């Protein structure tokens, strides 16, 4: 399966942004890869590993904000629609 972690953390104050970078660094340290800003994903082979990942996220959560964890199949993830504001692939 694929685990998707999307979070909505405050970025107003310098402490907020420090706390944002700490949680992002924790996710990367856990082997998550960025899909887009505030959205990270990781392949999991079974749900036991899934629930260990979520338990670790809870123990390492930031002081404020919302963190949500979605689990999907790799096929569902592969059929995600990708929309880019400036799509064209021109090289300089």
């Amino acid at each position: 399966m694929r685990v998707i972690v999307f979070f909505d953390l405050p970025v107003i104050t310098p402490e907020n942004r420090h706390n944002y970078s700490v949680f992002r660094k924790y996710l990367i340290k856990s082997g998550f890869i960025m899909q887009q800003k505030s959205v990270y994903s990781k392949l999991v082979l079974n749900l036991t590993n899934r629930d260990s990942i979520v338990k670790s996220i809870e123990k390492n959560k930031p002081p404020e904000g919302l963190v949500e964890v979605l689990t999907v199949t790799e096929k569902q993830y592969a059929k995600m629609e990708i929309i880019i504001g400036e799509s064209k692939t021109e090289y300089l």
Binding site: D51, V54, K55, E58, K59
Partner: peptide, 5 residues
């Protein structure tokens, strides 16, 4: 700390 989730 003994997380249940």
């Amino acid at each position: 700390i003994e997380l249940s989730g």
